[PDB]
Design an enzyme around this catalytic site. Structure first.
Site, mmCIF file in Angstrom:
data_model
loop_
_atom_site.group_PDB
_atom_site.id
_atom_site.type_symbol
_atom_site.label_atom_id
_atom_site.label_comp_id
_atom_site.label_asym_id
_atom_site.label_seq_id
_atom_site.Cartn_x
_atom_site.Cartn_y
_atom_site.Cartn_z
ATOM 1 N N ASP A 104 30.269 44.473 54.934
ATOM 2 C CA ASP A 104 31.278 43.695 54.181
ATOM 3 C C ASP A 104 31.688 44.454 52.938
ATOM 4 O O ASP A 104 32.825 44.407 52.550
ATOM 5 C CB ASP A 104 30.918 42.186 53.890
ATOM 6 C CG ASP A 104 29.565 41.891 53.262
ATOM 7 O OD1 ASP A 104 28.924 42.939 52.843
ATOM 8 O OD2 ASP A 104 29.189 40.766 52.953
ATOM 9 N N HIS B 15 35.426 45.736 52.421
ATOM 10 C CA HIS B 15 36.097 45.240 51.215
ATOM 11 C C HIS B 15 36.826 46.448 50.523
ATOM 12 O O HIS B 15 37.979 46.365 50.070
ATOM 13 C CB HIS B 15 35.006 44.581 50.270
ATOM 14 C CG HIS B 15 35.459 44.300 48.853
ATOM 15 N ND1 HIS B 15 35.631 42.978 48.363
ATOM 16 C CD2 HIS B 15 35.762 45.194 47.806
ATOM 17 C CE1 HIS B 15 36.133 43.111 47.092
ATOM 18 N NE2 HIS B 15 36.155 44.419 46.702
ATOM 19 N N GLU B 16 36.075 47.563 50.351
ATOM 20 C CA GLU B 16 36.647 48.746 49.713
ATOM 21 C C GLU B 16 37.884 49.281 50.481
ATOM 22 O O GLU B 16 38.953 49.580 49.902
ATOM 23 C CB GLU B 16 35.618 49.870 49.475
ATOM 24 C CG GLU B 16 34.349 49.494 48.634
ATOM 25 C CD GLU B 16 34.656 48.688 47.377
ATOM 26 O OE1 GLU B 16 35.781 48.564 46.847
ATOM 27 O OE2 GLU B 16 33.587 48.042 46.960
ATOM 28 N N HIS C 77 40.989 47.388 50.107
ATOM 29 C CA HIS C 77 41.778 47.638 48.885
ATOM 30 C C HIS C 77 42.840 48.729 49.151
ATOM 31 O O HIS C 77 43.900 48.745 48.586
ATOM 32 C CB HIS C 77 40.855 48.129 47.754
ATOM 33 C CG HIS C 77 40.194 46.994 46.961
ATOM 34 N ND1 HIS C 77 40.934 45.898 46.449
ATOM 35 C CD2 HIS C 77 38.906 46.828 46.537
ATOM 36 C CE1 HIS C 77 40.102 45.138 45.754
ATOM 37 N NE2 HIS C 77 38.903 45.662 45.780
ATOM 38 N N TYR D 86 46.194 44.980 39.622
ATOM 39 C CA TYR D 86 44.834 44.652 39.386
ATOM 40 C C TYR D 86 44.608 43.887 38.079
ATOM 41 O O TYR D 86 43.838 44.273 37.191
ATOM 42 C CB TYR D 86 43.923 45.912 39.570
ATOM 43 C CG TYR D 86 42.500 45.582 40.027
ATOM 44 C CD1 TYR D 86 42.191 45.274 41.356
ATOM 45 C CD2 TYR D 86 41.425 45.719 39.146
ATOM 46 C CE1 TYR D 86 40.875 45.064 41.788
ATOM 47 C CE2 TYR D 86 40.105 45.495 39.552
ATOM 48 C CZ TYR D 86 39.819 45.150 40.872
ATOM 49 O OH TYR D 86 38.501 45.015 41.277
ATOM 50 N N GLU E 100 41.401 41.030 45.104
ATOM 51 C CA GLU E 100 39.936 41.006 45.412
ATOM 52 C C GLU E 100 39.608 40.004 46.540
ATOM 53 O O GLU E 100 38.794 40.277 47.366
ATOM 54 C CB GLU E 100 39.079 40.631 44.135
ATOM 55 C CG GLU E 100 38.991 41.782 43.117
ATOM 56 C CD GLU E 100 38.423 43.045 43.789
ATOM 57 O OE1 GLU E 100 37.511 42.730 44.613
ATOM 58 O OE2 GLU E 100 38.554 44.177 43.364
ATOM 59 N N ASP F 119 36.943 41.038 32.842
ATOM 60 C CA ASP F 119 37.134 41.304 34.244
ATOM 61 C C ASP F 119 38.581 41.394 34.594
ATOM 62 O O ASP F 119 39.043 40.767 35.541
ATOM 63 C CB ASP F 119 36.449 40.184 35.072
ATOM 64 C CG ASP F 119 36.290 40.553 36.536
ATOM 65 O OD1 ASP F 119 36.245 41.685 36.934
ATOM 66 O OD2 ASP F 119 36.202 39.542 37.348
ATOM 67 N N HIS G 48 37.494 39.089 39.582
ATOM 68 C CA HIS G 48 36.388 38.789 40.422
ATOM 69 C C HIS G 48 35.918 37.349 40.278
ATOM 70 O O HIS G 48 35.027 36.903 41.049
ATOM 71 C CB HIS G 48 35.138 39.705 40.288
ATOM 72 C CG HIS G 48 35.429 41.104 40.672
ATOM 73 N ND1 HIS G 48 35.957 41.993 39.747
ATOM 74 C CD2 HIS G 48 35.332 41.747 41.893
ATOM 75 C CE1 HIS G 48 36.092 43.178 40.379
ATOM 76 N NE2 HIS G 48 35.718 43.060 41.665
HETATM 77 N N1 LIG Z 1 32.486 44.866 42.617
HETATM 78 C C1 LIG Z 1 32.166 43.907 41.555
HETATM 79 C C2 LIG Z 1 30.763 43.381 41.706
HETATM 80 C C3 LIG Z 1 29.671 44.388 41.431
HETATM 81 C C4 LIG Z 1 28.599 43.769 40.544
HETATM 82 C C5 LIG Z 1 28.367 44.554 39.265
HETATM 83 N N2 LIG Z 1 27.977 45.952 39.520
HETATM 84 C C6 LIG Z 1 32.502 44.366 40.110
HETATM 85 O O1 LIG Z 1 33.088 45.477 39.929
HETATM 86 O O2 LIG Z 1 32.281 43.545 39.159
HETATM 87 CA CA LIG Z 2 28.393 39.065 54.292
HETATM 88 CO CO LIG Z 3 37.117 44.923 45.038
#
Ligand SMILES: N[C@@H](CCCC[NH3+])C(=O)O
Ligand SMILES: [Ca+2]
Ligand SMILES: [Co+2]
Ligand SMILES: CC(C)[C@H](N)C(=O)O
Ligand SMILES: [Ca+2]
Ligand SMILES: [Ca+2]
Ligand SMILES: [Co+2]
EC number: 3.4.24.27
Length: 316
Positions: free
Chosen positions: A138, A142-143, A146, A157, A166, A226, A231
């Site tokens: 997953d 997910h990556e 993007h 973003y 996201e 964020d 997120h």
């Molecule tokens: N991909 C998310 C979750 C990772 C959790 C923190 N390293 C972020 O950039 O916040």
């Molecule tokens: Ca999962």
């Molecule tokens: Co992401």
């Protein structure tokens, strides 16, 4: 490199053995020629310069502990490419079979993974909060999703468009996890997060509030952390998509589930045909409804479910 296509074997982050597609030329490289213009995996050797070295191995066998993350990044990118091709008829992220690249062993104790606009990057984690991130299918999907969004809707973003971006990556990484039938669930990162604690995950689509993310529009975060809560607020959209798929009663609103396949069809269509870089939640609702209308008819159940799900999360 130019060489002969072959197949090697190794072991992933979780210890599972798998076969991977390699290229032989003096060395065996993690270069898969069977998919579009190729999938290539690099060793960033604990540095932050990218991409690092194309992965070279002497014997076509990848059982060393240092190999684990490369094997999974390499394999899971293949699976994700397959999902897009088979399921949505899309050739790689650009729709034109662009080569897919990933680097592993990025930096030291890096608890994250990301798409940098050209390739994917995976940390090894600190061993407490995470183990090497490419061990979660997953996470990998997910990556890669993007990239798909960058080339299509191009959702900026930050703020709502950023949360949508996201959510999209979580929806599709989860549909990929179900596709591969790799112990699927509606959680994000369960497999590589807090090796010590069983049962948790990073985010929950089925119940975002379980980890303190919003599950209703009235609870959105409106500050600046964020990037404006990309997120955080993605939970509202994640919840909606879960409902469309699985059905349920949320905040008093009942949704009949229409299943994963239709969820994917609907969302993929919205992403690729209707969304724009600056779309907001309310625009996503319109897009979703239009996609379903397209696909299934305006008086369809499908359209009905999409409406209900958004109403249930408070998105008008
Ligand atoms: N991909 C998310 C979750 C990772 C959790 C923190 N390293 C972020 O950039 O916040
Ligand atoms: Ca999962
Ligand atoms: Co992401
Ligand atoms: C770690 C991963 C799932 C992503 N870059 C966040 O969230
Ligand atoms: Ca899982
Ligand atoms: Ca855990
Ligand atoms: Co070897």
């Amino acid at each position: 490199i130019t060489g002969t296509s072959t197949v090697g074997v190794g072991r992933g982050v979780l210890g599972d053995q798998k076969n991977i597609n390699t290229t032989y030329s003096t060395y065996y490289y993690l270069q898969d020629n069977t998919r579009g213009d190729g999938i290539f995996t690099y060793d960033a050797k604990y540095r932050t310069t990218l991409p690092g070295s194309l992965w070279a191995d002497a014997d076509n066998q990848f059982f060393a502990s240092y190999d684990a993350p490369a094997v999974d990044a390499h394999y899971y990118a293949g699976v994700t490419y397959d999902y897009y091709k088979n399921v949505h008829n899309r050739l790689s992220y650009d729709g034109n079979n662009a080569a897919i690249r990933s680097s592993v062993h990025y930096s030291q104790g890096y608890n994250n993974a990301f798409w940098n606009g050209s390739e994917m990057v995976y940390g090894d984690g600190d061993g407490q909060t995470f183990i090497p991130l490419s061990g979660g299918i997953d996470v990998v999907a997910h990556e890669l999703t993007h990239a798909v969004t960058d080339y299509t809707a191009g959702l900026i973003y930050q703020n709502e468009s950023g949360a949508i971006n996201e959510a999209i990556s979580d929806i599709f990484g989860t549909l990929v996890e179900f596709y591969a039938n790799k112990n699927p669930d509606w959680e994000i990162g369960e497999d590589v997060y807090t090796p010590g604690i069983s049962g948790d995950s990073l985010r929950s689509m089925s119940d975002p509030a379980k980890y303190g993310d919003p599950d209703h529009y009235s609870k959105r975060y409106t500050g600046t952390q964020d990037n404006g809560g990309v997120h955080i607020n993605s939970g509202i959209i994640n919840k909606a998509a879960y409902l469309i798929s699985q059905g349920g009663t949320h905040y008093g609103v009942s949704v009949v589930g229409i299943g994963r396949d239709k969820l994917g069809k609907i969302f993929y269509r919205a992403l690729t045909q209707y969304l724009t870089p600056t779309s907001n939640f309310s625009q996503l609702r319109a897009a979703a409804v239009q996609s379903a209308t397209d696909l299934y008819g305006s008086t369809s159940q499908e359209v009905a479910s999409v409406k209900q799900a958004f109403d249930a999360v408070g998105v008008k």
